[PDB]
Design a protein around this nucleic acid. Structure first.
Ligand SMILES: [Mg+2]
Ligand SMILES: [Mg+2]
Ligand SMILES: [Mg+2]
Ligand SMILES: [Mg+2]
Ligand SMILES: [Mg+2]
Ligand SMILES: [Mg+2]
Ligand SMILES: [Mg+2]
Ligand SMILES: [Mg+2]
Ligand SMILES: [Mg+2]
Ligand SMILES: [Mg+2]
Ligand SMILES: [Mg+2]
Ligand SMILES: [Mg+2]
Ligand SMILES: [Mg+2]
Ligand SMILES: [Mg+2]
Ligand SMILES: [Mg+2]
Ligand SMILES: [Mg+2]
Ligand SMILES: [Mg+2]
Ligand SMILES: [Mg+2]
Ligand SMILES: [Mg+2]
Ligand SMILES: [Mg+2]
Ligand SMILES: [Mg+2]
Ligand SMILES: [Mg+2]
Ligand SMILES: [Mg+2]
Ligand SMILES: [Mg+2]
Ligand SMILES: [Mg+2]
Ligand SMILES: [Mg+2]
Ligand SMILES: [Mg+2]
Ligand SMILES: [Mg+2]
Ligand SMILES: [Mg+2]
Ligand SMILES: [Mg+2]
Ligand SMILES: [Mg+2]
Ligand SMILES: [Mg+2]
Ligand SMILES: [Mg+2]
Ligand SMILES: [Mg+2]
Ligand SMILES: [Mg+2]
Ligand SMILES: [Mg+2]
Ligand SMILES: [Mg+2]
Ligand SMILES: [Mg+2]
Ligand SMILES: [Mg+2]
Ligand SMILES: [Mg+2]
Ligand SMILES: [Mg+2]
Ligand SMILES: [Mg+2]
Ligand SMILES: [Mg+2]
Ligand SMILES: [Mg+2]
Ligand SMILES: [Mg+2]
Ligand SMILES: [Mg+2]
Ligand SMILES: [Mg+2]
Ligand SMILES: [Mg+2]
Ligand SMILES: [Mg+2]
Ligand SMILES: [Mg+2]
Ligand SMILES: [Mg+2]
Ligand SMILES: [Mg+2]
Ligand SMILES: [Mg+2]
Ligand SMILES: [Mg+2]
Ligand SMILES: [Mg+2]
Ligand SMILES: [Mg+2]
Ligand SMILES: [Mg+2]
Ligand SMILES: [Mg+2]
Ligand SMILES: [Mg+2]
Ligand SMILES: [Mg+2]
Lengths: 117, 146, 64, 204
RNA sequence: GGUUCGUGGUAGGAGAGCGUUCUAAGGGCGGUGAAGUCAGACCGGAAGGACUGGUGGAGCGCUUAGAAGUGAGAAUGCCG
RNA sequence: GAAAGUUAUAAAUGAAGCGGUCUGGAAAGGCCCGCCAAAGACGGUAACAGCCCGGUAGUUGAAAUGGCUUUCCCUCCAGAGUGGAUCCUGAGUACGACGGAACACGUGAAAUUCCGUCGGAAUCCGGGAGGACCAUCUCCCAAGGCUAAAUACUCCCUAGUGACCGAUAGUGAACCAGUACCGUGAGGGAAAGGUGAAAAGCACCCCGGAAGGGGAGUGAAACAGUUCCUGAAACCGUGUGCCUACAAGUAGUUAGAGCCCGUUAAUGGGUGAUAGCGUGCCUUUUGUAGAAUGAACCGGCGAGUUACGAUUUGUUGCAAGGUUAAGCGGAAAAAGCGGAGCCGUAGCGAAAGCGAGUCUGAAUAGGGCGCAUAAGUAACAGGUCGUAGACCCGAAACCAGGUGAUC
């Protein structure tokens, strides 16, 4: 028997066109450029899902360095003292303390100073 | 079997492989053929024995022999088959042909000497081998050529 | 249509009891003054078709 | 082994069936194979399309090979053209095949024993009608509680049986040498008279 | 159900599946609205599958098998 | 030339529910009750009907013409034996040389048959053939003619069938199709289906020259109004929530304020100032963002298939055995019958032949191939191969029959 290709192609192409909503110009209207746009966006998402962790760690390091230079300490010396004192708090929590609990951050910095000497 | 629960024997039927239907199946663009040769073309290929110009094997060795028009080939019967005819029975070609042990007598019946027999039989046959000769006569039977 | 036997090789090959193919040596026509007696004495026997050639010429003598 | 009824709906004694026919252990894979074989050999296979050599027209090359700026073409009935010929498509062809004889005997043997296993088989001593009357046949089918699709097997008893039962939607009558694997499988119950049972035992 | 070792990949080998049209049996829904079509923020590891609402105005799924004119983004591809 | 019968070409008769009720524009549908059936095929009827209509099963019917089958009529008819003295039994033929062809058979060791050209028999005590030819034997009588059935095909007519198509499909043509159109001509050759159950196809009023509209009316529906069921995408517009005139951008992704909303309710939706990272898809390549190729965009169509053989794997039946083919039978069935044939059970040798062995050889030597150390076969399914166009499109060219000197 004959199998004419109805109802199956449009359903498959419309999903790809719908996935490209918000793209400039005809990238959200035409199947052929929408397909390439969707593929490229998936690849970009896959790569940036790795780059995001590095970006946030760099932000935390910069913030901790800024907060620790006010205690007459580098980021390098402070991290060495914290490792040498036995404290195991990651950069995320240290940046949080630096931003909105500066007294506790100063306490931790004092402990790190004690450990160094 | 209810005709709505037909389950054929497992492993007896497989799914045909369709080539050239997308790259997800591994048989997509070039369809299992490679890139741009004589073997990648429709109807393309060489003969069964072609070697690309080198002399084929069959043409560097000589022909041998002839065929005899009067060639005679006999229907072969060993000895162990004869063990399942009761002793005292006259073994004759028609008995063999209707017993089913001989499908067709090509040019006659010849008795060979594989196995052992131990019962007295008298055998009617077109040809005998010497070993089969003393094998039959050592059990007290006799052999005569038709 | 049923497939045809290569008649040029049905005159050269013989099928043995294990399914292999038996052939003849091929330097035995007309220059016997140029090959020694050991060579001639060994070339007059029969040989076997090798595996590489059998892979190639199976179909041609299928019903031979 | 079985209870023998009558056309009136009552009992008339007992009937024994040959154990080598109605009492073997069914072989389901063989039955499936034979059902597929019998259903595949019922189809006509009268279907065809036209190649690029059978569509009317063609021959002339539509335009030059070079210089015109269009794609190279060779006919107006090529496969990719709008009215062109089909590439492979269907051809008239037969589908029938048969399994070895012993397998085909074992299949009917098994599918006929399975009916006895499921208590779907009814044996009655005789089935006859003075004249064709579908009302009386419906009454008889009401007397013997069936209320479903059934296959009635008969012998040389009454020709009025076949005529007075071809209007009922799920009823089929066969004369005891036409018994089939695919006919038996197609129906639910199986009413067979004594003479038909004797014939079936004789044949196989 | 557990322990150990693994899981980049072109040509290519092997395996398991989704979806389309038709047939057979069982079992269903549909003028209290079928297929199609439009829109959604739902579900599955993928191909994909439901649910709800609008338009439409008469046919269509499900389960187990079987058969194929079986899945298109490209051919200076053919037609609109 | 008649009589009878049958059949083909018009037709007749033909059972049973206006059943109640619900939705609905309309009931054939749902629910609850009845009946017919040798009739539950098919189609129509305001949605899906055995019981509404045409019909169906069954039973009937032919004035007229044709076909067929018998019978009568009509016509026409010698066949056995024994002797076979003597006569007859296909002449420029049968053959042969030379040159060709047909035979599976390419001149070959070339029998058999036919054509052209030359030569040219015997005739029953005779002649031909049995793959050069001779002898023996076996079979048969050329150089005259006729002959049904079994076989091949379908422009047609009747009755049906389909795991055949469904308007880019199926015939080139579902429609005034070999038409319109193109060409001097031979010749090439399209596009184009659907209002509604029923035209009930919009009386009348208003703007306008008209077309076209807004009401009114018919209709279940007019967003069914004469390309009229459904009505996707490209493409063209109107209105608006968020952003945008100091900015260098494969147009996105990750972080993210502000503003606007409220869902298949869940760590939701829309837009996004600013910051980081980021040179399309395909093909072909050692290597392409490539200044190498293809694609304006959207839609439909468009490429490993089938038949018959070979081989290998999986499954099923039987097993030293396995299995039928054509055909008969039948419903385009299923059994049954059909053992002819095929593969296997023994191999070695060029062959005579020998045989669990055999060949080479002077050999009981050695060595090659085999047995010991035995599972095959039928059917189906997957992979690959062969003959077929064989995976799809693409040449320049070749041959055969015709049409052209209106340039
Ligand atoms: Mg269809
Ligand atoms: Mg398509
Ligand atoms: Mg945006
Ligand atoms: Mg890190
Ligand atoms: Mg597969
Ligand atoms: Mg691959
Ligand atoms: Mg591709
Ligand atoms: Mg390529
Ligand atoms: Mg290359
Ligand atoms: Mg290659
Ligand atoms: Mg080709
Ligand atoms: Mg030689
Ligand atoms: Mg041999
Ligand atoms: Mg020599
Ligand atoms: Mg042509
Ligand atoms: Mg041509
Ligand atoms: Mg161009
Ligand atoms: Mg066509
Ligand atoms: Mg991998
Ligand atoms: Mg593969
Ligand atoms: Mg459909
Ligand atoms: Mg809908
Ligand atoms: Mg296709
Ligand atoms: Mg396109
Ligand atoms: Mg165009
Ligand atoms: Mg009536
Ligand atoms: Mg009603
Ligand atoms: Mg309707
Ligand atoms: Mg000659
Ligand atoms: Mg002549
Ligand atoms: Mg002679
Ligand atoms: Mg002969
Ligand atoms: Mg001879
Ligand atoms: Mg004649
Ligand atoms: Mg249409
Ligand atoms: Mg058409
Ligand atoms: Mg004209
Ligand atoms: Mg209409
Ligand atoms: Mg008007
Ligand atoms: Mg509408
Ligand atoms: Mg309608
Ligand atoms: Mg639109
Ligand atoms: Mg500036
Ligand atoms: Mg600005
Ligand atoms: Mg959001
Ligand atoms: Mg490469
Ligand atoms: Mg280069
Ligand atoms: Mg550029
Ligand atoms: Mg190129
Ligand atoms: Mg271009
Ligand atoms: Mg191929
Ligand atoms: Mg087996
Ligand atoms: Mg049969
Ligand atoms: Mg030896
Ligand atoms: Mg196969
Ligand atoms: Mg071509
Ligand atoms: Mg010519
Ligand atoms: Mg001519
Ligand atoms: Mg002229
Ligand atoms: Mg002139």
């Amino acid at each position: 028997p004959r199998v004419k290709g109805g109802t199956v192609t449009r359903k498959r192409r419309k999903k790809i066109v719908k996935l490209a909503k918000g793209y400039y110009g005809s990238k959200h209207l035409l199947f052929k450029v929408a397909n390439q746009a969707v593929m490229k966006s998936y690849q970009y998402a896959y790569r940036d899902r790795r780059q995001k962790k590095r970006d946030f760690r760099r932000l935390w390091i910069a913030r901790i360095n800024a907060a620790a230079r006010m205690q007459d300490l580098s980021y390098s010396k402070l991290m060495h003292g914290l490792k040498l004192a036995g404290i195991d708090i990651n950069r995320k929590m240290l940046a949080d303390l630096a931003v909105n609990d500066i007294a506790s951050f100063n306490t931790l910095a004092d402990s790190a100073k004690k450990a160094l000497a | 079997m209810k005709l709505h629960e037909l389950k054929p024997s497992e492993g007896s039927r497989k799914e045909r492989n369709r080539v050239g239907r997308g790259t997800g199946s591994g048989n997509g663009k070039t369809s299992g053929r490679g890139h741009k040769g004589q073997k990648a073309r429709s109807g393309g290929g060489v003969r069964l024995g072609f070697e690309g110009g080198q002399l084929p094997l069959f043409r560097r060795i000589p022909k041998r022999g002839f065929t005899n028009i009067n060639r005679k080939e006999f229907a072969i019967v060993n000895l162990d088959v004869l063990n399942r005819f009761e002793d005292g029975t006259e073994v004759t070609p028609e008995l063999l042909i209707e017993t089913g042990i001989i499908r067709n007598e090509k040019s006659g019946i010849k008795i060979l000497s594989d196995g052992n027999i131990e019962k007295k039989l008298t055998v009617k046959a077109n040809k005998f081998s010497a070993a089969a000769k003393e094998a039959i006569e050592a059990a007290g039977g006799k052999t005569e050529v038709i | 249509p049923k497939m045809k036997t290569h008649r040029g090789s049905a005159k050269r090959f013989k099928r043995t009891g294990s399914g292999k193919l038996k052939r003849r040596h091929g330097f035995t026509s007309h220059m016997f003054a140029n090959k020694s007696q050991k060579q001639k004495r060994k070339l007059r026997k029969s040989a076997m078709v090798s595996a590489g050639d059998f892979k190639r010429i199976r179909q041609m003598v299928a019903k031979m | 082994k079985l209870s023998l009824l009558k056309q009136d709906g009552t009992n008339a004694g007992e009937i024994t069936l040959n154990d080598t026919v109605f009492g073997i252990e069914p072989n389901e894979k063989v039955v499936v194979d034979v059902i597929l074989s019998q259903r595949a050999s019922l189809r006509q296979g009268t279907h065809k399309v036209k190649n690029r050599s059978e569509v009317r027209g063609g021959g002339r090359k539509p335009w030059r090979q070079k210089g015109t700026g269009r794609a190279r073409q060779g006919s107006i009935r090529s496969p990719q053209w709008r009215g062109g010929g089909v590439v492979f498509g269907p051809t008239p062809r037969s589908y029938a095949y048969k399994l070895p004889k012993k397998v085909r005997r074992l299949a009917i043997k098994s599918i006929l024993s399975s009916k006895v296993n499921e208590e779907k088989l009814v044996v009655l001593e005789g089935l006859t009608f003075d004249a064709p009357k579908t009302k009386e046949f419906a009454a008889f089918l009401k007397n013997i509680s069936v209320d479903t699709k059934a296959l009635i097997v008969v012998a040389g008893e009454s020709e009025n049986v076949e005529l007075s039962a071809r209007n009922l939607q799920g009823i089929t009558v066969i004369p005891a040498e036409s018994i089939s694997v695919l006919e038996v499988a197609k129906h639910d119950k199986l009413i067979i008279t004594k003479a038909a049972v004797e014939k079936v035992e004789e044949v196989l």
